[PDB]
Design a protein around this ligand. Structure first.
Ligand SMILES: CC(=O)O[C@H]1C(=O)[C@@]2(C)[C@H]([C@H](OC(=O)c3ccccc3)[C@]3(O)C[C@H](OC(=O)[C@H](O)[C@@H](NC(=O)c4ccccc4)c4ccccc4)C(C)=C1C3(C)C)[C@]1(OC(C)=O)CO[C@@H]1C[C@@H]2O
Ligand SMILES: Nc1nc2c(ncn2[C@@H]2O[C@H](COP(=O)(O)CP(=O)(O)OP(=O)(O)O)[C@@H](O)[C@H]2O)c(=O)[nH]1
Ligand SMILES: [Mg+2]
Lengths: 427, 517
């Protein structure tokens, strides 16, 4: 019951999804060969959410892996937790779309969305009662942004009732490995406004800040960042897998999280996070957990929440805790930091609680916050886009694939429209 | 010579062929690879992939002539113009409007105990009279079975029609739609009168099952033992409409007024049904892309009441053009197709332009010298001089005084495709509505963006649930009409409905003119 279809596109999406499947398979007691070796019965009671049951009690993850360059696919296959994905679930192309939004969305990636949709339909009909689709991709590339927008649109055209939550990586101001990435980012925000229900924003600058400050790690590679993203991904859908006292699913989160249809650009966080040389000098209690989750530094988006007002926040505790502590502490959060919440909506906090904690831990929290400061995360992009428009640069690589100039202006204007919408309610 | 493709003519093949031979046009019975001047399809516009030329099928007319769509358009217009659109008896769509039908019947019965109405139930997809029956009470509807999932139409039955030889008859009239922009409608001077095989009586519970005396369908009456096949145009179960009109005039009935109101109801149906055709044309043939021109022949079914008030029954996008031989059917249909083809000869416009260009006088430098006995041959023979006169009279689409205020939904239909976008998708998304609101400046302190979004969501949900298919991703044209009606109700309070909608259209047009300027 309540099955979730997973889609990965692009290099970042593929790597984050690989880490995510490794993380979940550890929690449900799945071996890298597919067999179940676990200690608790509860793990194998809702394995139908993420896994299909094949013969010989071997569980195949319900994931679809797409990209326009074959090489990355091999990287997924020849890795840990790699011979579990279905061989026919790897849909791939020949050339990796460069950094062209137009190539992925229009010319070379259009001859692959048909196969992806075929696999999507095949997976979606062997499910008892579908709950939604979740997709991991990275705005700023060619296959990620373009193929993800095309796929998302073509799926909401066919399933305009399910929940589409997207875990997307947004361009950062300091870290930047591309020169035409603002173009792709601007061309995609527009499609994410009217085709997704939840949009979790991630930037590599924030993850690097977390790995440098909170954890104090010497050489933080992409593995740690993918690990944190997998942690927050697993934490959101926990009240569908394990049992608790205040269970809240994706639709309940959306209802309590989105006051206006265009206002669904959240920002994530994961509470229990310490170094390896400090786990003994700190007590793992509910007060400490809720103090770390609302810390400005401990936020996986490069926007300062102090510059805006939280529209609404949802927290999903996992472990064995008393309701009174949770309610009292996350009421006291909104009496102290009172100026950081809007006033027209009282009780700006949603609380869920799942009994089973993550493995190796006792209590953990996943934080999802909708606040106006996310406008900055888009505002910067517009500025960059503007600087690349009046002196039209690298536009021939985009206009040579059928994209007209008017599309750029329309997408940009839609971006400022969303920014203005986020801004007006803050004042 | 004009090339005509008749590979998909079907029942219109033979009647076309002689017509093709009457115009000395040369045919492709099996088609060709190269583009053809005129393509003649029988059922669907999507029969062949046509990129240029002319096609005898407007896009989507199969769906429009369906009973529920025509009924929806008729009720929309009746809301817009009740008095004008009274020719269509009140209708309900099952199973969606069953409760409303029951409540209305109960309230009218309570108001008038002596009221004994008769209703007729017709399937949407049913043709040739199949599935059509008569009821006297809403409880008489057969609601137990697996056949009730199909949408149906319950209509007020005309219990008092005109009777000729004690037989109730209907009229099938052939109407030509030449173009949608500009609108051009032509009406044939003669039609086919189909008569019942049994004497007509007022509907009673004892004779509801008698379909022969209550249904004028040719396919149903042909199996009756009382059906008479006659070669004369004034006898038999199938006759010429001109003969019936002349018999009526023989009793002192003003046939000119009768013809005028037939023309009025035909034009009213066409205008009421046009805007969805413009939407479908934009969806299927986008502006700026190569595409063929379109026209259509429609079979209008009219029941002539004893008080000479017409009633529009069924409408058919694909009327039976088969002439088998039947003298009346041939004489009507072959002439209809011949006039149709003559009206749209691709060289007529070129010939007219050349004649107009050749008539420009060259004035200047007069100087005369003698010339002797050079007789110019009479090289101006009309190629159509041997053809009979066209019976599809050029009834003025620009009736003005007769028909100028009827263009209301058609007038505002362009607003839908203005914000449609790229690729001509059939539906309009929330961004389209919000851009429309921000463009025509309908938003204010009273109506903020949240209210607009709530209205859009509610209307879209209602119209998606209304249709048989539950997806309906987006907004159709009828939902846009409902939204425009609500917006026009909000503005210009304490004003008549005709003044409303029109005033909002004027304001929106003014704001648009400011925007482009
Ligand atoms: C010596 C010791 O105590 O090591 C612990 C540990 O508790 C620490 C170091 C862990 C450790 O995490 C990290 O050091 C880390 C570094 C970079 C990126 C991500 C993680 C740990 O890796 C993480 C790991 O946590 C889990 O097992 C959770 O279940 C977590 N990860 C996995 O299940 C998992 C499975 C397979 C492979 C890798 C991780 C999780 C939490 C929520 C939802 C899903 C998964 C644990 C107990 C440890 C180590 C091993 C050092 C921490 O784990 C998290 C992310 O909550 C980091 O801060 C917490 C708490 C501790 O300080
Ligand atoms: N947090 C992470 N960011 C990543 C990872 N891999 C790539 N990236 C970042 O994502 C951004 C986009 O690079 P990708 O090559 O993944 C984007 P895409 O696959 O859509 O591009 P093409 O394959 O060239 O079409 C860029 O800033 C990378 O540094 C990863 O594993 N984790
Ligand atoms: Mg790549």
């Amino acid at each position: 019951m309540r099955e979730i279809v997973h889609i990965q596109a692009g290099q970042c999406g593929n790597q984050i999804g690989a880490k995510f499947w490794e993380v979940i398979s550890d929690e449900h007691g799945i071996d890298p060969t597919g067999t179940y070796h676990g200690d608790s019965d509860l793990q194998l009671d809702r394995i139908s959410v993420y896994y299909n049951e094949a013969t010989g009690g071997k569980y195949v993850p319900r994931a679809i892996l797409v990209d326009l360059e074959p090489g990355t696919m091999d990287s997924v296959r020849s890795g840990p937790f790699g011979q579990i994905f279905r061989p026919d679930n790897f849909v791939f192309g020949q050339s990796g779309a460069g950094n062209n939004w137009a190539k992925g969305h229009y010319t070379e990636g259009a001859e692959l969305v048909d196969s992806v949709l075929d696999v999507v339909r095949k997976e979606a009909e062997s499910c008892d009662c579908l709950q939604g689709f979740q997709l991991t991709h990275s705005l700023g590339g060619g296959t990620g942004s373009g193929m993800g927008t095309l796929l998302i649109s073509k799926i909401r055209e066919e399933y305009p009732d399910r929940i589409m939550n997207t875990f997307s990586v947004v361009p950062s101001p300091k870290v930047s490995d591309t020169v035409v990435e603002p173009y792709n980012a601007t061309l995609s925000v527009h499609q994410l406004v009217e085709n997704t229900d939840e949009t979790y924003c991630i930037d590599n600058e924030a993850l690097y800040d977390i790995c440098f400050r909170t954890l104090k790690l010497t050489t933080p590679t992409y593995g740690d960042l993918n690990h944190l993203v997998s942690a927050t991904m697993s934490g959101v859908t926990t009240c569908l897998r394990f049992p608790g006292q205040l269970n809240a699913d994706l639709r309940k989160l959306a209802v309590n999280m989105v006051p206006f249809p265009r206002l669904h650009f959240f920002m994530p966080g994961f509470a229990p996070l310490t170094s390896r040389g400090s786990q003994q000098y700190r007590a793992l209690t509910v007060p400490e957990l809720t103090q770390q989750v609302f810390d400005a530094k401990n936020m996986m988006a490069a926007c300062d929440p102090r510059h805006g007002r939280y529209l609404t926040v949802a927290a999903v505790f996992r472990g064995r805790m008393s309701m009174k502590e949770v309610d009292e502490q996350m009421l006291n959060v909104q009496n102290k930091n009172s100026s950081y919440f809007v006033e027209w909506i009282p009780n700006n906090v949603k609380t869920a609680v799942c009994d089973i904690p993550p493995r190796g831990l006792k209590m953990a929290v996943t934080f999802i916050g909708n606040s106006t400061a996310i406008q900055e995360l888009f505002k910067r992009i517009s500025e960059q886009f503007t600087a690349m428009f009046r002196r039209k640069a690298f536009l021939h690589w985009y206009t040579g694939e059928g994209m007209d100039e008017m599309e750029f202006t329309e997408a940009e204007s839609n971006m400022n429209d969303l920014v203005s919408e986020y801004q007006q309610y803050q004042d | 010579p004009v090339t005509v493709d008749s590979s998909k003519a079907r029942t219109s093949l033979d009647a076309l062929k002689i017509s093709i031979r009457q115009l000395k046009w040369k045919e492709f019975p099996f088609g060709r690879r190269l583009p053809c001047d005129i393509y003649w399809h029988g059922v669907s516009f999507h029969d062949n992939d046509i990129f240029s030329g002319q096609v005898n099928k407007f896009p989507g007319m199969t769906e429009m002539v369906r009973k529920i769509t025509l009924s929806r358009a008729v009720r929309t217009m009746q809301n817009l113009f009740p008095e004008e659109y009274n020719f269509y008896p009140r209708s309900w769509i099952l199973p969606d409007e069953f409760q409303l039908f029951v409540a209305q019947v109960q309230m009218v019965k309570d108001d008038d105990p002596s009221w004994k109405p008769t209703f007729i139930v017709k399937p949407d997809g049913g043709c040739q009279g199949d599935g059509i029956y008569l009821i006297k009470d809403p409880s008489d509807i057969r609601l137990a079975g697996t056949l009730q999932s199909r949408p149906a139409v319950v209509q007020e039955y005309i219990c008092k029609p005109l009777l000729i030889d004690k037989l109730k008859f209907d009229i099938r009239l052939y109407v030509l739609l030449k173009s949608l922009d500009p609108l051009e409608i032509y009406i044939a001077k003669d039609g086919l009168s189909r008569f019942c095989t049994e004497p007509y009586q007022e509907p009673t519970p004892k004779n509801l099952h008698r379909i022969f005396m209550h249904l004028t369908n040719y396919s149903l009456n042909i199996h009756s033992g009382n059906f008479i096949h006659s070669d004369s145009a004034s006898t038999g179960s199938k006759r010429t409409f001109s003969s019936i009109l002349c018999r009526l005039s023989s009793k002192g009935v003003d046939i000119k007024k009768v013809w005028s109101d037939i023309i009025s109801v035909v034009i009213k149906t066409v205008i009421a049904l046009t805007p969805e055709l413009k939407v479908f044309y934009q969806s299927d043939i986008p502006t700026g892309r190569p595409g063929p021109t379109c026209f259509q022949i429609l079979g209008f079914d009219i029941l002539l009441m004893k008080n000479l008030k017409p009633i529009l029954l069924g409408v058919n996008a694909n009327p039976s053009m088969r002439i088998e031989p039947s003298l009346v059917d041939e004489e009507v249909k072959v002439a209809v197709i011949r006039d149709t083809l003559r009206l749209m000869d691709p060289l007529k416009k070129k010939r007219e332009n050349q004649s107009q260009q050749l008539e420009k006088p060259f004035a200047g430098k007069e100087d005369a010298l003698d010339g002797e006995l050079t007789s110019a041959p009479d090289c101006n023979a009309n190629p159509e001089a041997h053809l009979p006169s066209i019976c599809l009279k050029q009834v003025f689409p620009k009736y003005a005084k007769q028909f100028n205020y009827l263009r209301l939904v058609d007038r505002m239909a362009n607003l839908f495709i203005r914000f449609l976008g790229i690729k001509g998708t059939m539906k309009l998304g929330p961004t389209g509505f919000r851009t429309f609101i921000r463009s025509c400046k309908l938003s204010s302190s009273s109506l903020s963006m949240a209210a607009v979004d709530i209205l859009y969501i509610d209307i879209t949900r209602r119209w998606n649930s209304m249709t048989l298919d539950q997806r309906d991703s987006g907004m159709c044209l009828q939902a846009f009409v409902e939204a425009f009606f609500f917006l026009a109700q909000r503005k210009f309070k304490m004003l008549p409905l005709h003044e409303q909608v029109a005033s909002l259209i004027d304001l929106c047009e003014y704001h648009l003119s400011l925007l482009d300027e």
